[PDB]
A paper describes a structure:
pmcMarE is a bacterial enzyme that catalyzes a unique 2-oxindole production reaction through monooxygenation of (2S,3S)-β-methyl-l-tryptophan (β-Me-l-Trp). The amino acid sequence of MarE shares significant similarity with tryptophan 2,3-dioxygenase (TDO), a histidine-ligated heme-dependent enzyme that catalyzes the activation and insertion of molecular oxygen by a histidine-ligated heme into the indole ring of l-tryptophan (l-Trp), producing N-formylkynurenine (NFK). TDO and its closely related homolog, indoleamine 2,3-dioxygenase (IDO), catalyze stepwise O-atom transfers, completing dioxygenation through two sequential monooxygenation reactions. However, MarE diverges functionally by catalyzing only a single monooxygenation reaction on a tryptophan metabolite, terminating the oxidation process before full dioxygenation. To elucidate its enzyme-substrate interaction mode, we present the first X-ray crystal structures of MarE in complex with its prime substrate, (2S,3S)-β-methyl-l-tryptophan and cyanide at 1.89 Å resolution as well as a truncated yet catalytically active version in complex with the substrate at 2.45 Å resolution. These structures establish MarE as a member of the heme-dependent aromatic oxygenase (HDAO) superfamily and reveal its evolutionary link to indoleamine 2,3-dioxygenase (IDO) and tryptophan 2,3-dioxygenase (TDO).
MarE C280S crystals were obtained by crystallization in the presence of 50 mM sodium cyanide and 10 mM β-Me-l-Trp. The MarE C280S crystal belongs to a primitive monoclinic space group of P21 and contains four protomers in an asymmetric unit. The structure determined at 1.89-Å resolution forms a dimer of dimers, consistent with the homo-tetrameric oligomeric state of MarE in the solution state, without requiring further crystallographic symmetry operations. Each monomer consists of ten α-helices, with a disordered region spanning residues of 217 to 226. Conversely, in the 1.89-Å ternary complex structure with full-length (1–284) MarE C280S, the β-Me-l-Trp is unambiguously assigned, with the substrate amino group oriented toward the heme center and the β-methyl group directed toward the hydrophobic pocket in all four subunits. The substrate amino group is oriented towards the heme center, interacting with the main-chain carbonyl oxygen of Ala125 and the nitrogen of cyanide. The cyanide nitrogen, in turn, interacts with the main-chain nitrogen of Gly127, both of which are part of the DATG loop originating from the lid helix α5 and extending through the active site. The carboxylate group of the substrate interacts with Nε of Arg118 from the lid helix α5 and the main-chain nitrogen of Leu232, a component of the SLGGR loop. Residues from the neighboring subunit, including Tyr24∗, Val27∗, and Leu28∗, along with Phe51 and Leu121, create a deep hydrophobic pocket that accommodates the indole ring of β-Me-l-Trp.
Author numbering:
A (entry chain B): 2 to 215, 228 to 273
B (entry chain A): 1 to 216, 227 to 265
C (entry chain D): 1 to 215, 227 to 269
D (entry chain C): 2 to 216, 228 to 272
Write the structure that this text describes.
Amino acid sequence: KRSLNPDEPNALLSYDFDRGSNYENVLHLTDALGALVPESETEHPDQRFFQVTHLITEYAWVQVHYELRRAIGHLDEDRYHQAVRMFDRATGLSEVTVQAVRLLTDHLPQHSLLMMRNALPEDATGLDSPGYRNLRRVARPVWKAYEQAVERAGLSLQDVIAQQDDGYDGPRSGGSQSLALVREAMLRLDGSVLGWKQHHLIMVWSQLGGQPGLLPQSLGGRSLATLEARSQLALFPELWRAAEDAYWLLGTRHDTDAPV
Amino acid sequence: MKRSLNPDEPNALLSYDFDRGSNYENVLHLTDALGALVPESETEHPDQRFFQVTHLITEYAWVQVHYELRRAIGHLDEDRYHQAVRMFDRATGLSEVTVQAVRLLTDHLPQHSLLMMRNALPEDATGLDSPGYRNLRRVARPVWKAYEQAVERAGLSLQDVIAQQDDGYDGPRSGGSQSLALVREAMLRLDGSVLGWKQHHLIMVWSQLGGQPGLRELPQSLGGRSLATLEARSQLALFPELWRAAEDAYWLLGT
Amino acid sequence: MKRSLNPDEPNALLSYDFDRGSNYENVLHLTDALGALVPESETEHPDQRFFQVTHLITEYAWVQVHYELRRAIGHLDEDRYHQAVRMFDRATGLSEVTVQAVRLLTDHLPQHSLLMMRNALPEDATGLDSPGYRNLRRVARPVWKAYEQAVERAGLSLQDVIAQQDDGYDGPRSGGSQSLALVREAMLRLDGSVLGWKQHHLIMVWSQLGGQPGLELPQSLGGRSLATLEARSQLALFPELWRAAEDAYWLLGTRHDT
Amino acid sequence: KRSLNPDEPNALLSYDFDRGSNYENVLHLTDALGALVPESETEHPDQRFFQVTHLITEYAWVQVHYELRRAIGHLDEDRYHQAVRMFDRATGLSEVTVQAVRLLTDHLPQHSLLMMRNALPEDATGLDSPGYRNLRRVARPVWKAYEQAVERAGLSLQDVIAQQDDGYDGPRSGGSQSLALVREAMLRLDGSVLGWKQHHLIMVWSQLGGQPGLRLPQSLGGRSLATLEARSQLALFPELWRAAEDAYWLLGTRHDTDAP
Ligand code: HEM
Ligand code: HEM
Ligand code: HEM
Ligand code: HEM
Ligand SMILES: C[C@@H](c1c[nH]c2ccccc12)[C@H](N)C(=O)O
Ligand SMILES: C[C@@H](c1c[nH]c2ccccc12)[C@H](N)C(=O)O
Ligand SMILES: C[C@@H](c1c[nH]c2ccccc12)[C@H](N)C(=O)O
Ligand SMILES: C[C@@H](c1c[nH]c2ccccc12)[C@H](N)C(=O)O
Ligand SMILES: [C-]#N
Ligand SMILES: [C-]#N
Ligand SMILES: [C-]#N
Ligand SMILES: [C-]#N
């Protein structure tokens, strides 16, 4: 009934949509397609690709936030098994954001980006991303819910870390092994998000410069050094602290090795 | 000031704040896009949002596939082969996003959740009405046509274009022919990726509605149709002629 | 002191040097693995090495899949549900590596190269003799049996375990039934990934030997039509999971003639 | 035939191989499987998974090396289209190494790693990886071959970057656009290898510690994890990232003019 592409003479090349189908109705799809910059307003043929990769990312992150909320509810009621599924789903959605920014790295021409950017508004930065800002916000109540669940069960993090190793002989329970799977899914999620940050950094080096082996400024006026420093901020620093803790407590090698 | 996507959640740290009027949000029409999500007050199942978001991600990727394919037609019609290559490769990357979106359902959507949601869904609520799918199928013919006519204007045979992908092939080469070969190769990758989508979507359906063939009446879609019709449409390519040319090469070159 | 895979190479910067006796190399048995590559003096096509390596990578992932599935049997037999989960998830990740490796051929192996190489390959050189695939098919029943037995020892129904994946489900739950539910979900992900390998391998064959069904048939190096490949391609590792999926569709769906 | 696990007494669980089929003959598969540490010698059940992920990686890297040599040959003879394919193939092979290291991040138990690492030889390090040492060594001749091909065509790197943009109106030839496609493929390859380095770093943070947000552990060679992080930012083709930054300075019209 409608077309995103009205002035296209060739009718086989029209993007026909908004047919009022029940599939369309269920998804609020016409509403979501209405957010695309209208073809009559695009300033560069690469503009649509630019916008779509961000919208895909923001949809993935709002869903991450939704499932992390659910995981807080599960942990607060000691429903460990149900918490695991929320974290695994979140990791998968995170991996879509990684794919989406790597689309820019692999296919966004830097010269198109620079042309487009010379005309963008002044403080147009992903520091204002709602997916990113809310993922940072919610990470703290998420860690707290896990930490408190481990406490109620009378375990340490060193315990649940150790029980991932089949050869570890300490006594276990159903609850301790469930909290272990939770920790492992949480670590995979945080690893994925850290991966998003590194791939977005590699993208920036290919579009604006500043590859550290070799500074440019964001539209906010900020050196890329600031982006690069924030790129190593984790969702759950406590988990990475517990990893290093395991190295110090269980490694029996420190300050004894040398080159051969 | 910010708005909340979940404004009846008491704990502010659990609030999804957005619509802050930043230039990032303005340039992307992000607030409008987030407005497509079913309101939290109206969800009937906690997995409904996940359901919706995997579709919306897929449809954004497919409308972008369409946009880039139109560009590929424009290039091919003017013999801009290099520039056409990039459009096909970009489409393949977007298609791979759709594959991971539906595999998100395979890996994480509980069949039991799906069946409960499906019992309340409307009748003939089907992806046969997907704009992404229908318009992709629509545009695939003009796309094959633009590639075929560029090959014809070059006076090349498709068999020759296939052959010179092999470094060991000794026949005549030109910049034009090797360019059209890179276009060919990029086109086959795109179609193969789309055939991957169709199969992963089918594997999903097997895990959610049943009917895995290894088991040798079938379940039915929300429009009353057997899953065997889905399985048959699952092997239809975008560019049949490329798969015929591969078959022709085996017969001409196979000893 | 050292070896080279291309020793005659003029430019020393193009030499692939290995076997330097490092501890890294010693721990991994790397020299022996590199020793399996077709020698450069013996290659008959510049794409031969790509062909070989994609298979060797696949076979390494599948023997690891086998090792971890054996561990999953041992866990399930002792009711170590959580530990079994990890084995299945790991096998799934290893399976996804095999998907990547065959899609490398789809995306980058020229059909014309394949045909030239295929014309010179021995008779009945076929992946029906893949040790990875044969031992995977061997172990698939022992693996399903271990899961089924554990479910029975717990006095649960497969339909119950499926229902427990849904947060909205009101039925009785226990720590053991939800654990067995995470195991079911992990073995389904593995089987869907192996079904994914089969479909991508099929798509690759269509682009290299022909026979895309949307369009008598080509033959493998053993003489068999591609019709038998397509049929074997829908065979799952754990048919009883897919059976349980359809069982639930009839059991829970309320619109089968609506 | 023969079994990889002969002391397994249930024959349905034997991994049978060395059947002398032509499939195995062509592939040298029996020799390659013989590199696996024998089951009777493994000291931890996670040891095989550890070894196999390295072996997959080194197979992928030796194939990257082989195809980059071919790319040098193509470039020295101005066969641009042919070189593009070798770089694209290398990129796919690099992506296999990324998935292999991420298999350790997602599934290798830190506690098993530490147990295993406490018994490993001293200075057993991937600094002695042949895939890694040879890829670093060959990257210089690869870049020189591209650079010389660009010079011979009388082009600048700015020109081939600009020609990736459909809106750029400078004069083009078949050669210049072909050399652009080559550049774009080498950038994807180098970005993929930079991705491997970052995912390998994230893995190391989860196994030995040292995640930089928390602020050190030492390698089996006694070297601080800070040196690994420093080398993590070294590209194959630094000149490509230098030309990206060059484009920012030459073509961006915003520097030192924006602010929050
Ligand atoms: C899918 C596309 C993108 C997404 C989702 C995205 C998201 C983000 C996010 C969340 C941040 C804040 C991250 C942090 O500080 O840790 C950010 C910052 C930044 N992004 Fe992106 N980004 C995208 C594409 C781009 C592109 C194409 C460029 C440039 C070519 C770019 C350049 C930057 C810069 C320079 C910053 C730092 C802002 C500052 O410090 O003022 N990004 N982006
Ligand atoms: C991201 C999620 C999904 C997308 C993008 C999607 C898209 C599509 C498309 C494009 C078709 C038509 C394809 C063809 O006919 O060749 C289709 C059909 C179909 N899909 Fe989906 N789908 C999705 C999820 C699902 C789910 C979760 C189910 C069931 C649990 C499902 C079941 C079906 C069925 C049964 C058909 C056949 C329709 C008929 O023949 O009446 N799909 N879908
Ligand atoms: C990474 C590369 C490959 C791997 C790991 C692999 C593995 C396998 C396996 C396990 C089978 C038995 C599965 C079944 O028949 O259901 C098989 C069969 C088959 N493969 Fe492959 N394969 C690869 C590449 C190829 C290539 C490049 C071709 C031809 C272009 C090919 C053509 C066939 C055919 C025709 C069959 C049918 C069985 C027969 O040969 O009679 N495969 N492959
Ligand atoms: C697939 C598995 C792995 C591969 C292919 C691999 C490869 C490499 C390579 C190529 C290097 C040298 C790169 C550089 O330093 O710039 C390296 C260094 C290093 N790797 Fe790995 N690695 C793997 C797994 C691991 C694991 C499991 C650990 C520890 C838990 C580890 C810890 C380190 C450390 C500490 C270094 C720095 C060595 C030193 O500076 O002495 N790696 N690895
Ligand atoms: C290029 C620009 C930008 C990058 N992605 C954006 C999305 C919407 C609006 C602006 C942007 C980026 N933030 C920069 O500062 O360079
Ligand atoms: C599950 C159902 C459906 C699947 N995806 C949808 C999206 C919007 C509306 C309905 C659906 C699918 N079409 C079916 O026939 O089963
Ligand atoms: C091409 C050929 C073959 C495919 N993969 C192989 C590995 C080793 C030896 C031979 C092969 C394949 N089995 C065929 O029958 O066509
Ligand atoms: C754990 C260890 C190691 C990591 N990967 C290896 C492969 C072979 C031999 C040793 C290793 C690593 N090099 C370290 O220094 O911690
Ligand atoms: C992003 N900016
Ligand atoms: C989809 N239906
Ligand atoms: C495979 N053969
Ligand atoms: C790594 N060694």
